[PDB]
Amino acid sequence: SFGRILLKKMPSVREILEERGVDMTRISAEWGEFIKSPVVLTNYLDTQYYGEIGIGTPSQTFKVIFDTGSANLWVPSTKCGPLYTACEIHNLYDSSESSSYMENGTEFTIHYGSGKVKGFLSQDVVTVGGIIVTQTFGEVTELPLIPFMLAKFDGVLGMGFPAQAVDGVIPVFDHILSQRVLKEEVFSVYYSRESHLLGGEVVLGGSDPQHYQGNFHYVSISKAGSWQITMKGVSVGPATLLCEEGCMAVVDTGTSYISGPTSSLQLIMQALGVKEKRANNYVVNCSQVPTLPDISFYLGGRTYTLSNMDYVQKNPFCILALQGLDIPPPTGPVWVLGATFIRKFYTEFDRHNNRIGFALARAA
Numbered sequence: 234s235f236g237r238i239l240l241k242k243m244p245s246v247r248e249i250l251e252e253r254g255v256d257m258t259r260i261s262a263e264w265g266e267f268i269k270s271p272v273v274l275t276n277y278l279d280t281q282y283y284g285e286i287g288i289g290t291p292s293q294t295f296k297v298i299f300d301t302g303s304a305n306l307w308v309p310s311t312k313c314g315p316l317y318t319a320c321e322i323h324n325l326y327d328s329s330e331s332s333s334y335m336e337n338g339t340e341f342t343i344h345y346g347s348g349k350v351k352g353f354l355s356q357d358v359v360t361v362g363g364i365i366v367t368q369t370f371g372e373v374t375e376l377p378l379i380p381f382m383l384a385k386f387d388g389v390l391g392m393g394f395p396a397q398a399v400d401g402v403i404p405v406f407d408h409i410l411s412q413r414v415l416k417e418e419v420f421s422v423y424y425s426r427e428s429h430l431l432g433g434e435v436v437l438g439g440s441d442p443q444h445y446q447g448n449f450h451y452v453s454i455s456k457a458g459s460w461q462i463t464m465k466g467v468s469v470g471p472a473t474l475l476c477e478e479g480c481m482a483v484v485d486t487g488t489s490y491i492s493g494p495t496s497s498l499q500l501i502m503q504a505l506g507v508k509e510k511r512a513n514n515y516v517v518n519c520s521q522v523p524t525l526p527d528i529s530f531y532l533g534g535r536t537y538t539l540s541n542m543d544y545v546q547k548n549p550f551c552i553l554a555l556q557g558l559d560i561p562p563p564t565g566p567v568w569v570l571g572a573t574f575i576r577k578f579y580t581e582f583d584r585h586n587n588r589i590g591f592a593l594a595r596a597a
């Protein structure tokens with residue numbers, strides 16, 4: 234258990250609002266917006282998994298999201314003022330208790346779907362999966378209410394490329410690579426079946442052979458500075474409907490729902506046999522779930538199939554784990570294979586070869 238980080242299941246901000254009796258129209262309209270330098274593919278509304286890291290000497294524990302969509306580490310600060318009530322329900326980084334703290338002070342702004350996180354940079358020791366790196370990270374002093382007033386995670390560990398990082402900060406994984414401690418310059422991400430207790434695993438330096446079956450097959454990165462691959466077909470049932478001419482697709486551990494363009498996804502929802510739409514999202518009567526056809530994605534000359542049980546979430550109060558999202562050019566129309574895709578297919582992110590590997594996930 235050297236370079237492994239146990240991911241733990243948490244109620245998502247949608248699931249917290251659902252359990253408090255909030256209407257599905259209100260949740261999407263007020264907590265799930267996508268506002269018009271690096272690209273945003275998530276609002277953390279549906280994120281269900283966090284890992285724990287330590288920051289400082291002695292180490293102060295934080296619950297963080299492992300987000301391949303971003304390249305920055307940030308956590309709430311004790312410098313976070315009284316105007317930001319969201320800070321008052323989370324763990325706070327206190328430089329006063331760290332002997333390894335070294336100030337920087339340059340301001341940063343990280344944009345995401347529902348809003349923006351502001352603060353200042355600071356250097357300290359960071360322990361992630363038993364590996365100690367000297368990291369520059371964001372001390373957040375302006376944490377917005379949407380969605381962090383109800384989030385069950387403190388902050389975000391970016392697992393993206395250094396080109397995506399704000400203020401040109403060297404990311405956490407890049408520092409781990411500089412140390413030459415890992416067997417491979419890769420990390421892989423496992424989510425187990427959607428249960429109440431069962432969690433997941435991020436492995437640094439390789440892949441856990443317990444959590445996959447058969448063999449990995451790899452797809453090259455098509456855009457240099459991100460986990461982005463060419464998709465050559467989206468199919469409902471036997472019929473291939475979209476992406477024959479070639480779609481860009483991001484594999485993102487940050488968001489759990491698969492994203493596509495609103496027009497392309499509405500076409501899929503028609504052919505799926507699904508009428509009801511709430512903003513970006515699509516709800517369905519739980520009686521008609523077993524009759525839904527399989528969705529498939531064509532990646533690196535192989536099909537990756539999601540069955541009815543893989544892309545639907547039953548919560549007490551059934552919602553499809555797909556949603557509309559239009560990123561404009563030059564970045565272009567993009568799909569996002571979120572954690573729903575990765576739960577089915579154990580994913581290896583490869584930094585040396587600049588490629589992404591997929592394999593059929595399983596339990597032990």
Ligand SMILES: *[C@@H]1O[C@H](CO)[C@@H](O)[C@H](O)[C@H]1NC(C)=O
Binds near residue numbers: 354369400
């Ligand atoms: C703060 O961090 C940045 C990296 O984003 C670095 O280039 C800069 O030299 C640092 N500034 C100070 C004053 O330590």
